[PDB]
Amino acid sequence: MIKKPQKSKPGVFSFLDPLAYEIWMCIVFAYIGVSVVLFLVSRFSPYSESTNEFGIFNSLWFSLGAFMQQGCDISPRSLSGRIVGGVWWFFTLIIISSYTANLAAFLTVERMVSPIESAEDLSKQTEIAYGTL
Amino acid sequence: SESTNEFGIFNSLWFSLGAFMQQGCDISPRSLSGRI
Amino acid sequence: ILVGGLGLAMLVALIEFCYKSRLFDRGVQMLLTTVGAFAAFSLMTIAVGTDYWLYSRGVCKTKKKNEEVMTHSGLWRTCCLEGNFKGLCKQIDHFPEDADYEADTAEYFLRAVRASSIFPILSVILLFMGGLCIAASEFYKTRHNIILSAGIFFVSAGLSNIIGIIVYISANAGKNSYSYGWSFYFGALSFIIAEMVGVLAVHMFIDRHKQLTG
Amino acid sequence: GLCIAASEFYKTRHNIILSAGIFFVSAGLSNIIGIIVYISANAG
Amino acid sequence: AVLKLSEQGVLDKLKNKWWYDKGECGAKDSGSKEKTSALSLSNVAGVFY
């Protein structure tokens, strides 16, 4: 007989678990600033002005549908306009594909090891004592 | 006249990129032996 | 590199504005593509005729077989440096080991392609053949579709270049911490230019076609 | 913060207004990278 | 006299001679458990073809 060593239960947000608390906050920061620079180079006095399609939050919407794989409606055309996006494509390719690798790792196993039985380490270790009546 | 193919050298480079990514593009080959 | 690309992207956005705030010269583009193609015709043949492509540690000549000699290794002459005799260049082919795996006819054919410069020599050929036709735009001219077939040879040469690169790298494993000679890069560098030439032929074809259409 | 006041005094140049917002966006770039390296320093 | 050659390691030089200077059957399979290896290019050979 030994103790019962205290398994922790999953939470409500257990799908958010295979990415640490900071990066979720970090990615949103990066999400916004990517979008505005796209919108920065979007409207830059084309030398009418009513030329580009990338609007204020429309630039935000391109950044989202690029991020999650659903596609978009319109592509950038400028040299500077396209050189930002492939970076963001390369960003979102690495990140959330890496998310799935960790996400599979949670659905594998949850067994707490509950240290070594048929004891035999009570002979070997000096850590946990053991007695009788 | 003939201004048919939208693919310049820059867009062909560009379509090559997002094809390797997940994100598709509007331009598409549309014509045989380029479509393949 | 995410953030580093952003101000990099913004920087190029600035210079377009001032450049418009205040290729070029057709005809010497025809002169431009010659010096590109001829120098590409050099560096292809340079790396081909080269006893050294990669640095590694092997032997010089056996049957000498001390432990291992560092090697100034390339295609034909697997010549060695840093030894009791330096610069003794061996000729190397495929060798029959135990049972030879003849049933691996995919491998034996891969051996048969290997001990040959078959694609890197052919990468010279169309580059040489493309080098023939680029001079023909003045003498016996105004046929102006033979100009189009010239750039075909350059692009197909880079195809012949790139496949020879693979099979040589496929032959290497076919740790040691081997490195590369600078001459190995020369076929890779000329691979770029052989494509950079032939695209410019298409412009000059279509502009002469645009001059033909008028 | 300097150039935003300059839209009245010595005005009607009206392209120096454009360079002002460059500094704000690039400041957030300078902000976000300092956030990372401090968090990188925590486990570092 | 045995203890000299052991101390002079001449046995090892002979042990290199009759086992290791005649390493012939060049198989050299040991096997590492590290799954951290990048793939070969030759693993992806025919894809380019």
From Swiss-Prot, chain A:
Chain ranges passing through the membrane: 21-41, 79-99
Post-translational modification: Palmitoylated. Depalmitoylated upon L-glutamate stimulation. Cys-72 palmitoylation leads to Golgi retention and decreased cell surface expression.
Cytoplasmic compartment segments: 73-78
Compartmental location: Cell membrane; Postsynaptic cell membrane; Postsynaptic density membrane
Induction pattern: Down-regulated in the pyramidal cell layer of CA1 in the hippocampus by global ischemia.
Superkingdom, taxonomy of origin: Eukaryota
Residue ranges within the lipid bilayer that do not cross it: 54-69, 70-72
Tissue: Detected in forebrain. Detected in dendrites of neuronal cells. Expressed in the pyramidal cell layers of CA1 and CA3 and in the granule cell layer of the dentate gyrus.
Residues where lipid is bound covalently (S-palmitoyl cysteine): C72
Record-annotated site: Crucial to convey clamshell closure to channel opening: I116
Assembly and interaction partners: Homotetramer or heterotetramer of pore-forming glutamate receptor subunits. Tetramers may be formed by the dimerization of dimers. May interact with MPP4. Forms a ternary complex with GRIP1 and CSPG4. Interacts with ATAD1 in an ATP-dependent manner. ATAD1-catalyzed ATP hydrolysis disrupts binding to ATAD1 and to GRIP1 and leads to AMPAR complex disassembly. Interacts with GRIP2. Interacts with GRIP1. Interacts with NSF via its C-terminus. Interacts with CACNG2, PICK1 and GRIP2. Interacts with GRIA1 and SYNDIG1. Part of a complex containing GRIA2, NSF and NAPA and/or NAPB.
Additional remarks: The postsynaptic actions of L-glutamate are mediated by a variety of receptors that are named according to their selective agonists. This receptor binds AMPA (quisqualate) > L-glutamate > kainate.
This protein's domain notes: The M4 transmembrane segment mediates tetramerization and is required for cell surface expression.
Record family assignment: Belongs to the glutamate-gated ion channel (TC 1.A.10.1) family. GRIA2 subfamily.
Function field: Ionotropic glutamate receptor that functions as a ligand-gated cation channel, gated by L-glutamate and glutamatergic agonists such as alpha-amino-3-hydroxy-5-methyl-4-isoxazolepropionic acid (AMPA), quisqualic acid, and kainic acid. L-glutamate acts as an excitatory neurotransmitter at many synapses in the central nervous system and plays an important role in fast excitatory synaptic transmission.
Protein name: Glutamate receptor 2
Gene name for this UniProt entry: Gria2
From Swiss-Prot, chain D:
TM ranges: 16-36
Tissue: Brain.
Top-rank taxon, per record: Eukaryota
Coiled coil: none
Disorder association: Defects in Cacng2 cause the stargazer (stg) phenotype. Stg mice have spike-wave seizures characteristic of absence epilepsy, with accompanying defects in the cerebellum and inner ear.
Quaternary organization: The L-type calcium channel is composed of five subunits: alpha-1, alpha-2/delta, beta and gamma. Interacts with the PDZ domains of DLG4/PSD-95 and DLG1/SAP97. May interact with GOPC. Acts as an auxiliary subunit for AMPA-selective glutamate receptors (AMPARs). Found in a complex with GRIA1, GRIA2, GRIA3, GRIA4, CNIH2, CNIH3, CACNG3, CACNG4, CACNG5, CACNG7 and CACNG8. Interacts with GRIA1 and GRIA2. Interacts with MPP2.
Family of the protein in this entry: Belongs to the PMP-22/EMP/MP20 family. CACNG subfamily.
Name of protein: Voltage-dependent calcium channel gamma-2 subunit
Residues of the full protein shown: 119 to 162 of 323
